[PDB]
Design a protein around this ligand. Structure first.
Ligand SMILES: Nc1ncnc2c1ncn2[C@@H]1O[C@H](COP(=O)(O)OP(=O)(O)NP(=O)(O)O)[C@@H](O)[C@H]1O
Ligand SMILES: Nc1ncnc2c1ncn2[C@@H]1O[C@H](COP(=O)(O)OP(=O)(O)NP(=O)(O)O)[C@@H](O)[C@H]1O
Ligand SMILES: [Mg+2]
Ligand SMILES: [Mg+2]
Ligand SMILES: [Zn+2]
Ligand SMILES: [Zn+2]
Lengths: 703, 614
DNA sequence: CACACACTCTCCAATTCTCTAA
DNA sequence: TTAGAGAATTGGAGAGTGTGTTTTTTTTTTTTT
């Protein structure tokens, strides 16, 4: 077969038969092999070497190709791909298998076929806009998955035992169109009750989903359109009911006598043969992270001011509210679940309650967390129910047996449940979340179903006080209207007030008007870009797991004991035992923010500060100052310790001068590791050595 | 061709030599022919089954083990036929009435790590798989034909002892009459019919295996897998059991076009955990015999929880239970103990429920908010397979013989709460709905957790802290009102305990002195429950009588002094509750009689509940 | 199961082609 | 030039094969009570 120098001249054919014949088929095969081997990104890095290597590391049998890259590098393949998608995807699968077995010669033991998936295809279509013009073409659509079958085995290459003799009928390919009837046995011509040879038959995973238009893209009072889609092989369980997805697939039609007799006209059934599923929720998975991305994340973690940067990156368009940003950062990164002895589970997720005045950006904080977090569920007040929050039982739509279904807390199982207008809920709806908040489970005993579902989510709620205005004359317990069991289930408990303060009002006004200028259609520390923050968050949550070695038990124990005393004194907030475990969770969350594999006293002091400041915030005006001096003098607001390193430096300089008269930074840091004062960067940024005329340089190491 | 039969003969011979030659032991100690001995003893007991270990088979001959893994259906019948041969030559001669050799069911187990239900993908069809899960449904046991004979309606031409393939696969009757000439009539289109008197049938059962709760991906519902059980695997498990299934992943063989329904043909069941080995048995005798068994049990209840010793002791009494009785006139007296924990938040009530559900031999946990009357007791519904009304058990039925842990007990609706009165006292559920009229058993303890009406107890409020009715409250043997006491040294010790508890999660889960592991205490509770039912001694009963009268007079005078009725009544059910607690304390020690010491301890525990009343 | 419809195949004989006489 | 006797082709009768069928109750959930 001679190489074909121009695929583009169809010479009167259509694309389907043109690429079906051998010459153009081999030319397409070689072009796709060369594309995979030689395509490089803007930095010159061979992207497909990395992608195939990751696929073979993880045994995933599927290779995502970016259509933008294909169109940029090899034009005619991008030209023919949407016109004859089945044929070219078959050729691409063959070529990808050749390249994969060139890279990893033993990968045939793991797979026998590589599925090339296409992403970022510009041929986006609305479900309501699909026409007969799109038939047998590669389309891209969006919608919410509303139904899913179980993963079912489907015949792909089926063999039949002959009904009389021992012969086996040849491989017949399943089509998605009709049942394959064997015909007659070529040995003996019998055509009786044939039966499938299960052992010699090749099966494939099958899953039929129904997607419909997303409820925010449909018009009000209008019914949504929907399509069936077939997921085959490793595309099964790419989505669940409720998932917003983008779906690339072949728009396929076949004759259906049922539709013909339903309509009275020869109407053909339609289905999408899915090629690529991408959840609009998970725009970036952990598998999508490249070596550049993880190198960026790990190098960025070494900044040593990263905690302030991460805190500042929480809702960068909101002035002030540094304590809110801190608490939301800790909740967003989260702690670690633990189960000592396999018999005592304790939650790792941190729950947050933002109570306070109108127009104080509580809802804006909640919508920011919704936007930034993967697996965010947002709900509001009366719009939620006990049943809808937790889980619900219904007659199955077609078969009519009772079936359990996932509520918001179950759907957010490794994510965030956001409850705006939390005080406006019904008590019966609000009490439903207790088990999910603490025990991280939802137990249902209804209509013959008796089971517990996992609801390991983090609850971030927003509320108003009684009368819609916080009263410093009263404590939090006196003006919230919530009760102790629900108040104690929130680890971080924030009060936001809108009191007059002219200088802060001027700065806030300038920030707000500057924001309106910046975002037109066209604290000090600087934040991360939000894309980088999302990548950092998912890496920190999935690839990093803090472990607590010690936390200086005496400090936290004494703190908890007298925090209990003052809570009993004022009645401002119940403290129970949950606040201790909140301390451990917040320490683990700060360690995760710093990407530490092990928790340290830096994290413990951060958690201590958060707890004490919020508890102080719950108090009245006069009581608040006395509480401030109480917990500040006696307990640990460990701001800095520069004096010890200062006189260690002075002592070392005095001894060195005395030695020389009659590498100092190495001497200093040696003493700083000998004594438990290891955070020396703070001393090097502080003024105490500077006005004493010392200085530092990481290269010269002289001071 | 017959070369396939030659292959079958040699493979059956190799399985026979495995079962004839396999030994365990060492030359220093001695050898025992494991599978010969098991075959002999089971056949003489009339059991006609054995369980073979895949690792033993692989050590003997790895090719046979590989063949069983890859092609279990083909080679398991050869293994079973070899087992039948070995059974014959191991048991011959047999007495009269046992001359006819029986078929042997060969079950399989392995030490291999199991796969998940979601690991079962199309590459593994017809292969041998091992998966865990929970039995959530189990059908009635029914008959599956293993051998049939079919007779032709015209000529009475008969085919005899047709082998029926195991599993949910059926059989195709021949399309045209076999082996005789095409005469007149040639054939009516179904010439054959199954002869009624010649069929050989075996028991079979259908079960639903649910995915384990900790195996489910985040946000997804647990998956279901159908299980086909056969012969002695029928009724080996019930709903609520945790199992490791060994079986053949297969399609049924008599939404989409080429879609086939899959199931697992079970070849072995390992209940994860009706029998105690003698070593466990004598160790349980020892454990009951030692003098501080009550304290050891109480320290074993929820060891990660600081304090609450009286509550743990009452929970131990609830776990062991009293003794159920039927009196000469046919009336039944409840044996189970009902316990309510009521009060302040963050006091480990939910942790105690989560411990008891895991420690009890039979135990179910449910939230009061998430439950209903039908879902707790029993529900009535129509079946899509046959339009008739059937019953489905609720929490009480599923926990019959054990404990229902009702968390959030104050949150359930009152109309749903009145459903469990009969199941709490009479231990029965009388249903009369949709024509079906019956009375099911619900012999289970209720361990309930609840909060105050005002969250905390708020001690000035008194009786207004309780919205429960006297009817439901009188059905609880003990009502522990739990108050979170703010004491400084208590708080320091509790905080250090919690911090150490969180710190120690990485310590490789080492054994501990002076307490019973949960897996052992579960078995011990089951053993004591099935073995020992105590009674009161006479003098002990006299002590209980007099103390009860004193307590009743005190309760009456307290209510009279208050001029208001207390929410907790002191009734004859509370007398019988004290009796049940004393019997549970004796049952911990396996003593046939309850002593004055047991009655005194029961009264001590009950006087916490009487403190909670007065 | 069993009694009507729906469909194919085969054989039989009736019509038309070819060659001859009236 | 008509038409009639013998041979070959086409019409359709009928024998044979295969397919399809015979309001009710309990429970949930949201909204309205
Ligand atoms: N500190 C702030 N910085 C920037 N914008 C702010 C700030 N405080 C309030 N806003 C703006 O105020 C508007 C209202 O915010 P919103 O989150 O709805 O208030 P809220 O906390 O939800 N009050 P409420 O809904 O009655 O509970 C938004 O446009 C915010 O951007
Ligand atoms: N004495 C204790 N020892 C150890 N952990 C404790 C103790 N008391 C409370 N806790 C912890 O507190 C948390 C809440 O426990 P939980 O079982 O929900 O108590 P509760 O009384 O049921 N709370 P609530 O449902 O609001 O009434 C868990 O993480 C427990 O481990
Ligand atoms: Mg708001
Ligand atoms: Mg609780
Ligand atoms: Zn054949
Ligand atoms: Zn016959």
């Amino acid at each position: 077969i001679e190489s074909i120098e121009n695929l583009e001249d169809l010479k009167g054919h259509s694309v389907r038969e043109w690429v079906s014949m051998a010459g153009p088929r081999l030319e397409i095969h070689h072009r796709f092999k060369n594309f995979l081997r030689t395509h490089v990104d803007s930095h010159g890095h061979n992207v497909f070497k990395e992608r195939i290597s990751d696929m073979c590391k993880e045994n995933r049998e599927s290779l995502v190709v970016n259509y933008e890259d294909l169109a940029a590098r090899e034009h005619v393949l991008a030209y023919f791909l949407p016109e004859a998608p089945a044929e070219l995807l078959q050729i691409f699968d063959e070529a990808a298998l050749e390249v994969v077995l060139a890279m990893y010669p033993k990968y045939d033991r793991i797979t026998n076929h590589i599925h090339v998936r296409i992403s970022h295809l510009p041929l986006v279509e609305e479900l309501r806009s699909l026409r007969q013009l799109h038939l047998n073409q590669l389309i891209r659509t969006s919608g919410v998955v509303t139904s899913c079958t179980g993963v079912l085995p489907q015949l792909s290459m089926v063999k039949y035992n002959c009904n009389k003799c021992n012969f086996v009928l040849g491989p017949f390919c399943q089509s998605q169109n009709q049942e394959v009837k064997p015909g007659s046995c070529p040995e003996c011509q019998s055509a009786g009750p044939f039966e499938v040879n299960m052992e010699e038959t090749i099966y494939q995973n099958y899953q039929r989903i129904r997607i419909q238009e997303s409820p925010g893209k449909v018009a009000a009072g209008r019914l949504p359109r929907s399509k069936d889609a077939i997921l085959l092989a490793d595309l099964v369980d790419s989505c669940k009911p409720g998932d917003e997805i983008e779906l690339t697939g072949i728009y396929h039609n076949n004759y259906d006598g049922s539709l013909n007799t339903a309509n009275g006209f020869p109407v053909f059934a339609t289905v999408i043969l899915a090629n690529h599923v991408a959840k609009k929720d998970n725009k970036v998975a952990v598998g999508e992270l490249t070596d550049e991305d993880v190198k960026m994340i790990t190098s960025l973690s070494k900044d040593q001011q990263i905690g302030e940067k991460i805190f500042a990156s929480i809702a960068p368009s909101i002035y002030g509210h540094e304590d809110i940003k801190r608490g939301l950062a800790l909740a967003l990164f989260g702690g670690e679940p633990k189960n000592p002895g396999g018999k005592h589970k304790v939650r790792g997720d941190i729950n947050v309650l933002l109570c306070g005045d109108p127009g104080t950006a509580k809802s804006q904080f909640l919508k920011y967390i919704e936007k930034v977090s993967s697996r965010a569920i947002f709900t509001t007040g009366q719009g939620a129910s006990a049943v809808g929050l937790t889980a619900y039982v219904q007659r199955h739509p077609v078969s009519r047996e009772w079936t359990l279904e996932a509520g918001a807390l179950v759907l957010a199982d490794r994510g965030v449940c956001l409850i705006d207008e939390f005080d406006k809920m019904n008590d019966q709806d609000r009490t439903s979340i207790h088990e999910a908040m603490e025990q991280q489970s939802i137990s249902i005993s209804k209509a013959g179903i008796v089971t517990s579902l996992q609801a390991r989510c983090t609850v971030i709620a927003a509320a108003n006080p009684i009368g819609g205005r916080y009263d410093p004359s009263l404590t939090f317990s006196e003006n919230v209207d919530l009760t102790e069991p629900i108040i104690s289930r929130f680890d971080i408990l924030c009060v936001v007030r809108d009191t007059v303060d002219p200088v802060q009002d001027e700065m806030l006004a300038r920030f707000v008007v500057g924001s309106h200028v910046r975002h037109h259609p066209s604290y000090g520390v600087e934040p991360l870009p939000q894309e980088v923050l999302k990548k950092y968050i998912i890496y920190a949550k999935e690839r990093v797991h803090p472990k607590l070695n010690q936390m200086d038990q005496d400090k936290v124990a004494k703190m908890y004991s007298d925090l209990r005393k003052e809570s009993m004194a004022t009645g401002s907030i119940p403290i129970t035992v949950r606040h201790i475990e909140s301390m451990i969770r917040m320490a683990e969350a700060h360690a995760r923010i710093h990407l530490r594999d092990y928790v340290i006293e830096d994290d413990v002091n951060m958690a201590i500060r958060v707890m004490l400041e919020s508890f102080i915030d719950t108090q009245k005006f006069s009581v608040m100052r006395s509480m401030r001096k109480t917990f500040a003098r006696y307990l640990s607001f460990r701001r800095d310790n520069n004096e010890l390193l200062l006189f260690i430096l002075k002592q070392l300089v005095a001894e060195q001068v005395t030695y020389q008269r009659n590498v100092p930074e190495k001497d200093l840091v040696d003493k700083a590791r000998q004594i438990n004062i290891h955070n020396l960067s703070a001393f090097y940024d502080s003024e105490l050595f500077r006005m004493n005329k010392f200085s530092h340089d990481l290269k010269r190491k002289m001071i | 061709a017959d070369e396939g039969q030659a292959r079958k003969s040699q493979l059956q011979r190799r399985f026979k030599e495995f079962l004839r030659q396999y030994r365990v032991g060492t030359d220093r100690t001695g050898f025992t022919f494991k599978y010969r001995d098991e075959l002999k003893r089971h056949y003489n007991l009339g059991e006609y089954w054995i369980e073979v270990e895949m690792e033993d088979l692989a050590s003997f001959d790895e090719d046979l083990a590989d063949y069983l893994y890859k092609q279990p259906a083909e080679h398991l019948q050869l293994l079973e036929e070899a087992a039948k041969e070995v059974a014959d030559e191991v048991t011959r001669p047999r007495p009269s009435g046992e001359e006819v050799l029986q078929d042997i069911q060969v079950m399989l187990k392995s030490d291999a790590s199991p796969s998940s239900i979601r690991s079962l993908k199309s590459d593994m069809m017809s292969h041998l798989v091992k998966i865990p899960g929970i039995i959530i449904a189990a059908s009635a046991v029914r008959a599956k034909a293993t051998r049939i004979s079919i007779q032709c309606r015209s000529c009475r031409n008969t085919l005899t002892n047709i082998a029926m393939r195991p599993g949910l696969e059926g059989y195709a009757l021949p399309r045209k009459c076999n082996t005789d000439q095409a005469g007149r009539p040639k054939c009516p289109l179904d010439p054959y019919f199954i002869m009624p008197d010649k069929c050989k049938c075996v028991d079979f059962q259908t079960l639903k295996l649910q995915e384990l709760p900790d195996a489910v991906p985040h946000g997804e519902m647990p998956r279901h897998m159908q299980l086909y059980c056969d012969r002695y695997l029928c009724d080996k498990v019930v709903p609520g059991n945790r199992v490791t299934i060994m079986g053949i992943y297969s399609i049924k063989k008599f939404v989409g076009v080429g879609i086939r329904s899959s199931y697992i043909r079970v070849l072995g069941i390992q209940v994860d955990t009706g029998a105690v080995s003698p070593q466990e048995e004598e160790e349980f005798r020892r454990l009951a015999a030692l003098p501080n068994v009550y304290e050891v049990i109480s320290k074993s209840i929820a060891p990660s929880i600081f304090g609450g010793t009286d509550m743990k002791k009452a929970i131990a009494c609830l776990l062991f239970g009293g003794s159920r009785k039927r009196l000469p006139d046919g009336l039944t007296r409840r044996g189970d103990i009902n316990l309510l924990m009521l009060g302040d938040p963050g006091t480990a009530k939910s942790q105690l429920l989560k411990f008891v559900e895991k420690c009890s031999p039979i135990g179910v946990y449910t939230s009061g908010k998430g439950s209903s009357a039908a879902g707790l007791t029993a529900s009535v519904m129509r079946d899509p397979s046959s339009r008739n009304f059937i019953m489905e058990g609720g929490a009480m039925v599923l926990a019959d013989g054990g404990v229902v842990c009702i968390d959030e007990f104050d949150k359930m609706r009152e109309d749903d709460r009145v459903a469990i009165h009969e199941a709490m006292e009479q231990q029965t559920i009388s249903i009369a709905k949709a024509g079906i009229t019956t009375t099911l058993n619900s012999r289970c303890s209720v361990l309930a957790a609840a909060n105050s009406v005002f969250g905390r107890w708020d001690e000035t409020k008194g009786e207004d802290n309780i919205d429960f009715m006297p009817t439901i409250l009188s059905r609880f043997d003990m009502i522990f009102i739990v108050k979170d006491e703010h004491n400084e040294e208590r708080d320091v010790m509790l905080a250090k305990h919690v911090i150490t508890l969180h710190v120690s999660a990485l310590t490789q889960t080492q054994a501990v002195e002076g307490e019973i592991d949960l897996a052992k205490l579960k078995k011990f509770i089951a053993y004591c429950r099935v073995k020992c039912g105590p009674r009161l001694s006479a003098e002990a009963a006299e002590k209980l009588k007099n103390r009860y009268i004193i307590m009743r007079s005190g309760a009456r005078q307290h209510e009279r002094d208050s001029d208001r009725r207390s929410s907790i009544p002191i009734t004859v059910r509370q007398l019988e509750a004290i009796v049940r607690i004393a019997e549970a304390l004796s049952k911990m020690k396996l003593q046939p009689f309850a002593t004055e010491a047991d009655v005194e301890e029961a009264l001590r525990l009950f006087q916490v509940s009487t403190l909670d009343a007065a």
